[PDB]
Amino acid sequence: FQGMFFYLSKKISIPNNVKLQCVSWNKEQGFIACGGEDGLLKVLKLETSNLSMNQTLEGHSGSVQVVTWNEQYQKLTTSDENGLIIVWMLYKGSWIEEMINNRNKSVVRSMSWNADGQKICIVYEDGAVIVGSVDGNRIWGKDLKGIQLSHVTWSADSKVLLFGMANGEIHIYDNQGNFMIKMKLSCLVNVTGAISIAGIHWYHGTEGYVEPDCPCLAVCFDNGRCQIMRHENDQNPVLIDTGMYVVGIQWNHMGSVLAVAGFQKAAMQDKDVNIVQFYTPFGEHLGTLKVPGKEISALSWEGGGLKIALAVDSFIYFANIRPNYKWGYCSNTVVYAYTRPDR
């Protein structure tokens, strides 16, 4: 449709066909990290698959269902379904362990570093929360007794937290864990049965926004509904029905595209096909990409926004992507235009 263009450029296939659960791609230094079953963690780096570094990392006791990056400091954070939390550092060209932690009680469902990389929020399933400094020292910890979280994000200034709730409900807290309000989930009009948050992602504005007061915060659900807010209590957000079973969502680094990873029932079969659908912040559909394999597990953009890594059935595919730049050539001048961090 109207928009950019993209195609499957590469693959990486993992030994013994170990299924990936999660992937995420560093942007200040460009490492991929991917977490699979049986304690699989690997770090991979592309260069010009013909990748220039490929290190497996060991210590996890089950599927590595959280992998996440500090950009501002040279640190990878990971945890598994057995609740060992590890922070790795790149030392003498190798990812070594710096700190090790275990609560000994519940699955770590999600994490997020804050927009300045000075703090991590870590959210358990049973109700606990931790906030810890980049020093590794714990700051505070609640226990939100009554409901199970399943998701988290910060706000752009790090003043607000969004916790998700596993029953398809979202609660907004200050950065001290004081409950402010339940978020309005207006895309869930005309729905039946249980709902689950498939993902939340908030573009913290670092390359500047597409417009002043543009939508910044995307929410999506397992039923295929999606909702894009201007701020945490925007009660008139952009509404989308994707028409597919969503597994996760990611903004590109410039905040100008939302990618939505999922699968759809194939048109003549009782079989599902994996798709990524690309959307503008305003909810216009830029395109659809198919991918081969049993399931797409996870989604992440390169720091330049020119590739997107798709974790699928023990493989990582890489879609090349050719931006629809605001550009043109006139009389031996090139015209190129970009959003700014500071205007």
Binding site: F1, Y325, V334, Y338
Partner: protein
């Protein structure tokens, strides 16, 4: 006159062309079942693509509906050859096709079809450019490859990442936006790259292999105004003033004919080198040639012609001879004028008080 220069039209309307009417912006909110998804225009027609796969042809400079076509696809992009008879259509699926707007198809169902979908097909097309000058040269990206066409027949693919920037004079300019936008405040010359299509590379290869004399036979067999200039600049650089004259005659360049006539009167080969080095824009090399020739006067003469009055004055100060008083006066006054015309009055005073 200003009045007829703006108009507005609804996509389901059937305009005649005739009316320099007022802007009926109220018509623009009438709902349509098949909206617009791409448009293009050629200085001769406007082509509008609906989401049904209907394509509408309108005239220009005045807008009247000429014909409605229908196709088996939605258009993602549309572009027209300069003669405005072939439409290059990219489908929503990233597949190329050409549609000859004035023409006849035989269809394998057992049929004759008018508005001709040509037999051409290619996949993963996303950037394209019809040549500005030629009605059947075309260029088209796939991935990190560009497949230049003549008519429906592809050339050798060219290795390239960047976007198709300009296409004329047998050259395609390409631009590396993906490199520029990593550090947009410090772009480099290398982020734009020039490609030569095969007829130009073959002619440049012949001139290097077969040599300037007999390479001209291929250009007499298959002439193009870009190739006559290439033979002319080659013949000038190897001092073949006879073949250079003919090459300038074949492309009607009277400045070039006068220049070979001027070179052909000079007595000194060193001076013919200094003068011909000037022709390409190598002025620093021509100046060094004149200084090596003990022609500081021709070095200053070249700088006077180019307007480098700081260099004129630098040569007059640094030379062995007594600098002409009226020439130091001219030099200072032209540098004074250079700053005064740029509103730098405090700089202009420094020169005008000497001059």
């Amino acid at each position: 006159r200003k009045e007829g220069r703006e108009r507005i039209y609804h996509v389901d309307d059937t305009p005649s062309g005739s009316m320099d009417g007022v802007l009926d912006y109220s018509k623009t909110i009438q709902g349509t079942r098949d909206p617009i998804c791409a448009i293009t225009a050629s200085d001769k027609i406007l082509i509008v693509g609906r989401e049904s796969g209907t394509i509408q042809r309108y005239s220009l400079p005045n807008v009247g509906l000429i014909q409605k076509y229908s196709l088996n696809c939605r258009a993602y992009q549309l572009s027209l050859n300069c003669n405005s008879s072939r439409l290059a259509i990219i489908d929503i699926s990233g597949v190329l096709t050409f549609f000859d707007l004035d023409a006849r198809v035989t269809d394998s169902t057992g049929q004759q079809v008018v508005g001709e979908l040509l037999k051409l097909e290619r996949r993963d097309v996303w950037d394209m450019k019809w040549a500005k000058d030629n009605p059947d040269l075309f260029a088209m990206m796939e991935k990190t490859r560009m497949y230049v066409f003549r008519n429906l027949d592809p050339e050798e693919p060219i290795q390239t990442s960047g976007y198709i920037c300009n296409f004329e004079d047998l050259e395609i300019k390409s631009v590396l936006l993906d490199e520029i936008l990593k550090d947009p405040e410090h772009p480099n010359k290398d982020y734009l790259i020039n490609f030569e299509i095969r007829s130009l590379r073959d002619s440049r290869a012949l001139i290097e292999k077969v040599g300037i004399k007999d390479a001209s036979q291929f250009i007499e067999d298959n002439p193009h105004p870009r190739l006559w200039r290439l033979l002319a600049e080659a013949a000038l650089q190897k001092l073949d003033l006879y073949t250079a004259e003919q090459a300038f005659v074949r492309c009607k360049d009277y400045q070039g004919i006068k220049f070979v006539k001027r070179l052909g009167k000079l007595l000194s080969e060193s001076m013919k080198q200094a003068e011909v080095v000037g022709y390409f824009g190598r002025f620093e090399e021509a100046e060094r040639t004149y200084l090596e020739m003990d022609r500081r006067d021709l070095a200053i003469g070249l700088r006077l012609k180019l307007g480098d009055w700081f260099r004129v004055l630098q040569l007059l100060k640094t030379g062995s001879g007594d600098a002409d008083d009226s020439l130091l006066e001219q030099a200072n006054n032209a540098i004074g004028d250079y700053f005064a015309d740029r509103q730098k009055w405090l700089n202009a005073v420094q020169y005008y008080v000497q001059g």
